[PDB]
Design a protein around this ligand. Structure first.
Ligand SMILES: CCCCCCCC/C=C/CCCCCC(=O)OC[C@H](O)CO
Ligand SMILES: CCCCCCCC/C=C/CCCCCC(=O)OC[C@H](O)CO
Ligand SMILES: CCCCCCCC/C=C\CCCCCC(=O)OC[C@H](O)CO
Ligand SMILES: CCCCCCCC/C=C\CCCCCC(=O)OC[C@H](O)CO
Ligand SMILES: CCCCCCCC/C=C\CCCCCC(=O)OC[C@H](O)CO
Ligand SMILES: CCCCCCCC/C=C\CCCCCC(=O)OC[C@H](O)CO
Ligand SMILES: CCCCCCCC/C=C\CCCCCC(=O)OC[C@H](O)CO
Ligand SMILES: CCCCCCCC/C=C\CCCCCC(=O)OC[C@H](O)CO
Ligand SMILES: CCCCCCCC/C=C\CCCCCC(=O)OC[C@H](O)CO
Ligand SMILES: CCCCCCCC/C=C\CCCCCC(=O)OC[C@H](O)CO
Ligand SMILES: CCCCCCCC/C=C\CCCCCC(=O)OC[C@H](O)CO
Ligand SMILES: CCCCCCCC/C=C\CCCCCC(=O)OC[C@H](O)CO
Ligand SMILES: CCCCCCCC/C=C\CCCCCC(=O)OC[C@H](O)CO
Ligand SMILES: [Ca+2]
Ligand SMILES: [Ca+2]
Ligand SMILES: [Ca+2]
Ligand SMILES: [Ca+2]
Ligand SMILES: [Ca+2]
Ligand SMILES: [Ca+2]
Ligand SMILES: [Ca+2]
Lengths: 607, 616
């Protein structure tokens, strides 16, 4: 037997013909086609996958893992140059982490492609063709229910005590969960600290009720500078961290395609690998002619539904004006609309997940960036369109404050209960349920660990987690002049968000597969667009204030021209400030430059 | 003993001690410090008995030395497997068109660039001054060519023209497609890139010239008709600047200059610093802290540019106050032209003074690469030149709201000003250079020398010829053209029509200028139009504000909003914001490089990583 790292669960009554065929492709040497891994049953069609120490190192070279050398330079790992890497020893096995090991096994299983097989053996309906990903076809047909990495109980407990006042152990989170999860907790810790100045500046604006032109201009000016500087400083900080990790030096563009990518099997022009080939023009037409108009239709429908709610609030007001039964009827449109939004968010996410898969993206990073962008513009509109309507159409600041107060207090408390506190309570209960199933079996230590983690919840991704902080940044940068405590409640929620999300990662969901991320992805553009919208918002809210309108009693045209001029000047200064601040620090830029120079000198020597 | 390529002219009475020292650095092997080139006077000791040397010296190099110098600068040439790779003397056989029996592998322009590069990287070792001139002090690492030019010991350094090659290019240059690859072979990537952009921009303006033509002819002054033209204008602005990026990428890849990593190149002769080892390249060159350069940029240079920009607006206001005093006075018909004549003269005094101050500050900023010095200098001079040109135009259009005066202002700029510009730019300097040329040839024939003074006459002629200042003044013409077209096409519909007409003669006027006016300019391997891309893109961003304002200002739109002028502005500003977002999305959607170039650049990026894994 070996050390079990990844588990594969097959459907209730899968044919032996299929099971043995799957075993062969996971065991057979790469020369004969198929991953050179180890396969063994749990003893429920649950199977354990591992690999040799030498096989793992060869797999680490294949994915291109960047590790620190003895000369303190970060280089991509090679089995021939294994001795030059810092912390390496042939007597050791602790060179690659369990998270790295499980990622390599996932990568090899994802790149398992059909050779001469015209279908999955035993299942003629589950057809195959040369180049088609086996893992994808197995998951699509339903022969393979799920593939997941195993938790290291002892390691997870050690991290837990260091995770949940102090600085978060981002390097420890990286070692166990990966670059993508650690980057989220890295951004969460940063954003919480970033919001602190805005929370302290905004605090006396509420306490002493500061409603002056000069006082609002000072706060909004600081807000617009803060928005740019924090998003620029994040880029520099992230560049430092990812360089230290080695994921920044990784050339992810030359990586093998995702299992969901289909195409005619051929030779890649760049890498020279035998993989599926798909024309970019076919993907582009699906993006701009089918997907883009659909997103615009859902965005228009979101505004149409929102208008129905604001028309329903009018009918509910008139009925109360025409007293026990009417007071209940006033809450009814707010309850209906919030429910319709949840029905819309779950339906649009299914349609978005379908279209991004149908678009046929080659890399997982591309699929993620396009999917995030679709779901995000929808989630942003359904959340802020009503907020913009109350603020600039209805011009009711009392209702806007009450709207933001519900979003920042009551909604965030309920979110934490639904996000981790309730699922943790229910997972503790499932812990007993699994323990009883194993007692019926009568050494079932690993058996209990697999049965528990198999039935555990699957972590969907960092989207819902980042969206919370994106919407937070939305309320803070946009309406801080209306609701000065916006950043104060954002920091307070984020103080428990770190503890709650950590609990959600450790004791709720099963171990998620690590992804070597070098940044927050398309979220940088999303957050920067929010800081651009905040210029329009802050200039409009100040221009709308009766203190400014007192100076312009008749000439309202002049006032708007002044506001628009100031807005244009600020947008130019905001661009200049972002351009002036370099996205990478000097020392990282030099370290990246000398390695770029070395690659060119290497190419001259090789040719 | 060799083929002369570059000429070095020394001051009237330079000491022999200085001359022999300069000769030694230019001849001595690179191992002992100094370029391994060949140095010889214009006239040999026997020829010097018939005619004076005038302290003129010819520089050349060996065929093998030139190839080693081509590797040093990192010239990218096409291989036998059709891949573009940087030249290496060990891998010389793998490059397409290479032969040991030949010498026509590297062009004369490439050869002269390599010699210039070696002379620029000539640095002082133990010498505490230029021998014979104690005032011209030296320190370890200081560029000799820079100190020689600063002190005035070396008057100038310039490449020699190839008369026969220039005449062959002239006949193929001056309806047809411009020979950009032929211009590249003689003048270089920078000069050919300008003519490449000129040819492109002229074709790009043609749709706008044809669309705008019936707007003038039939006097189309409708809301729908102006919105259609302005909508087309804003789409055109983005698409042409995006398609240029793609076209330039194709051209610079074919040339090989796109595959050049210019960031690792040796510093410009004007760059000073403490001699040390470079952290990236490992070369012994001057080192200067970036923070010192940054402080000079944001604390001294940036406030100065802002002061000159404020003064430009202040001087403009005095002109618009002078035109009020002239309108009230109306001998009077002559007095009306007087304030316009005064302001235009003050503009010229301001543009020549600001350019001296800008050239000083960009040199003082101490930029390491020539490309950086150029981009910062262009940016300073351009914002000033743009403001003086357009601030008065914006004032007439949006403050005075006089469209009749704006049309007449644009008509002078696009017709009379462009005709006069062509006379001053090439036609008059050509006439004056031709007159001098005939006079030099007739002077030498009168001597009847007992020596062959063919090369002597060629050097004396090209030495006294005008020096080409750079592509700035040439690109600025097209930038200002793009300015009048993208911004005020709704007011002046013939803007693009007169722009194309001028550009039809501009190609021939600038070709005559480069062939028969200025002496051969040193080639610079450029991979793009530089900071001009940002300049042109900013102009297309300003055109959204301009077109939205001019339409919103029209009485047809104001007829719909008689009292609610606040509502009208809010609609205009909303439309402007929506268009600016769509303009950004369109630019983001169009990839700056074509698919085939991106793949060719990717496989070469992959090869470099595979090479680093094999080497380590
Ligand atoms: C990381 C922690 C950062 C902590 C930072 C310190 C917070 C002190 C509060 C400042 C509010 C703004 C008060 C200044 C603006 C203000 O009131 O100006 C009106 C004029 O005085 C009217 O003339
Ligand atoms: C005698 C003909 C001379 C040759 C001239 C060639 C001009 C080619 C292009 C013109 C664009 C015209 C755009 C017109 C705008 C347009 O279609 O407007 C809709 C309705 O006219 C609104 O009422
Ligand atoms: C940042 C400070 C911006 C300036 C804020 C003060 C400001 O706009 O003051 C106007 C008058 O002095 C008072 O109405
Ligand atoms: C501490 C933050 C801001 C101080 C702003 C100081 C300027 C306030 C200002 O201009 O107030 C109009 C009288
Ligand atoms: C509401 C619709 C608004 C449309 C604004 C138009 C274009 C976006 C660019 C705006 C200029 C600012 C800019 O590029 O800022 C850099 C960083 O975002 C700073 O953090
Ligand atoms: C009356 C109002 C109706 C409003 C209707 C909507 C108009 C478009 C709005 C915003 C631009 C959003 C652009 C984002 C598109 C987006 O997410 O594209 C990802 C790709 O589709 C992935 O393949
Ligand atoms: C809608 C497109 C414009 C949204 C604003 C926008 O893209 O702003 C620039 C960002 O800084 C880039 O990340
Ligand atoms: C506030 C919502 C932000 C959503 C992200 C920006 C999307 C705009 C498209 C950019 C080009 C692709
Ligand atoms: C090629 C770009 C064309 C755009 C057409 C824009 C729409 C122009 C017509 C338009 O705005 O028409 C309003 C009323 O129908 C007439 O006042
Ligand atoms: C070319 C443009 C054709 C524009 C066609 C649309 C013209 C338009 O909307 O005219 C309002 C009546
Ligand atoms: C690129 C094109 C930019 C165009 C900017 C348009 C700004 C004015 C918009 C609406 C005012 C209402 C329409 C009044 C005219 C009308 O219908 O006249 C019969
Ligand atoms: C002081 C007043 C200055 C007034 C000047 C306007 C400033 C507008 C603000 C930001 C630029 C946003 C640019 C968005 C469009 C954009 O990114 O376009 C890409 C290419 O330019 C397309 O060709
Ligand atoms: C609008 C402000 C434009 C300000 C012009 C800035 C400008 O040209 O800066 C170049 C550097 O000063 C070069 O060192
Ligand atoms: Ca939460
Ligand atoms: Ca969360
Ligand atoms: Ca930046
Ligand atoms: Ca001209
Ligand atoms: Ca010109
Ligand atoms: Ca008004
Ligand atoms: Ca582009």
């Amino acid at each position: 037997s070996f050390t079990p790292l990844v588990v594969i669960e097959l459907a209730q009554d899968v044919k032996e013909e299929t099971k043995e065929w799957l075993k062969n492709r996971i065991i057979a040497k790469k020369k004969d086609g198929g991953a050179q891994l180890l396969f063994r049953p749990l003893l429920q069609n649950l199977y354990l996958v591992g690999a040799s120490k030498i096989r793992m190192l060869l797999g680490a070279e294949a994915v291109g893992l960047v590790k620190e050398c003895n000369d303190n330079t970060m280089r991509a790992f090679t089995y021939r140059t294994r001795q030059n890497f810092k912390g390496f020893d042939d007597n050791n096995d602790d060179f690659l982490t369990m998270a790295e090991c499980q990622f390599i096994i996932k990568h090899e299983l994802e790149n398992l492609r059909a050779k001469d097989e015209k279908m999955i053996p035993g299942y003629p309906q589950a057809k195959l063709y040369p180049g088609k990903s086996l893992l994808r076809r197995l998951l699509t047909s339903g022969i393979v229910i799920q593939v997941f990495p195993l938790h290291d109980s002892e390691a997870l407990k050690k991290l837990e005590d260091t995770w949940y006042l102090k600085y978060q152990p981002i390097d420890s989170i990286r070692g166990y969960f990966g670059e993508t999860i650690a980057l989220y907790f890295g951004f969460l810790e940063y954003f919480t600290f970033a919001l602190i100045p805005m929370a302290v500046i905004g605090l006396p604006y509420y306490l002493f009720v500061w409603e002056d032109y000069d006082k609002y201009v000072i706060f909004a000016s600081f807000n617009l500078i803060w928005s740019t500087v924090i998003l620029e400083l994040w880029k520099r900080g992230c560049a430092n961290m990812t360089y230290r990790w080695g994921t920044l030096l990784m050339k992810r563009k030359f990586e093998e395609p995702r299992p969901g990518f289909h195409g005619v099997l051929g030779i890649n022009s760049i890498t020279g690998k035998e993989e599926p080939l798909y024309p970019s023009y076919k993907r582009q037409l699906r993006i701009y002619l089918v997907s883009l108009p659909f997103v615009c239709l859902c965005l228009y429908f979101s505004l149409y539904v929102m208008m129905i709610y604001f028309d329903m609030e009018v009918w509910a007001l008139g009925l109360h004006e025409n007293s026990e039964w009417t007071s209940v009827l006033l809450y009814v449109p707010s309850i209906i609309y919030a429910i319709v939004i949840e029905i819309m968010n779950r339906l649009y996410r299914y349609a978005a997940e379908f279209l991004t898969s149908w678009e046929n993206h080659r890399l997982e990073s591309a699929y993620q960036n396009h999917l995030i962008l679709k779901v995000l513009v929808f989630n942003f509109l359904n959340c802020f369109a009503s907020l913009f309507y109350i603020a600039f159409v209805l011009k009711d600041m009392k209702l806007l404050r009450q709207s933001l107060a519900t979003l920042l207090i009551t909604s965030q408390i309920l979110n934490q209960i639904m996000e981790s506190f309730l699922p943790y309570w229910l997972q503790r209960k499932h812990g007993v349920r699994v323990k009883r199933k194993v007692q019926a079996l009568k050494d079932a230590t690993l058996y209990e660990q697999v049965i528990l983690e198999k039935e555990m919840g699957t972590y969907l991704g960092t989207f819902d987690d980042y969206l919370e902080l994106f919407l937070q940044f939305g309320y803070v940068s946009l309406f801080s002049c209306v609701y000065p405590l916006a950043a104060a409640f954002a920091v307070l929620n984020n103080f428990t968000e770190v503890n709650s999300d950590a609990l959600k990662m450790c004791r709720v969901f099963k171990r998620p597969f690590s992804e070597p991320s070098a940044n927050i992805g398309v979220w940088q553009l999303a957050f920067e667009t929010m800081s651009v919208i905040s210029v329009v918002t802050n200039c409009a809210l100040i221009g709308m204030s009766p203190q400014v309108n007192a100076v312009f009693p008749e000439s309202k045209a002049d006032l708007i021209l002044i506001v628009v001029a100031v807005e244009h000047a600020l947008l130019a200064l905001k661009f200049i400030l972002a351009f002036a601040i370099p996205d990478k620090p000097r020392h990282i830029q030099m370290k990246l430059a000398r390695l770029e120079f070395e690659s060119l000198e290497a190419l001259k020597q090789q040719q």
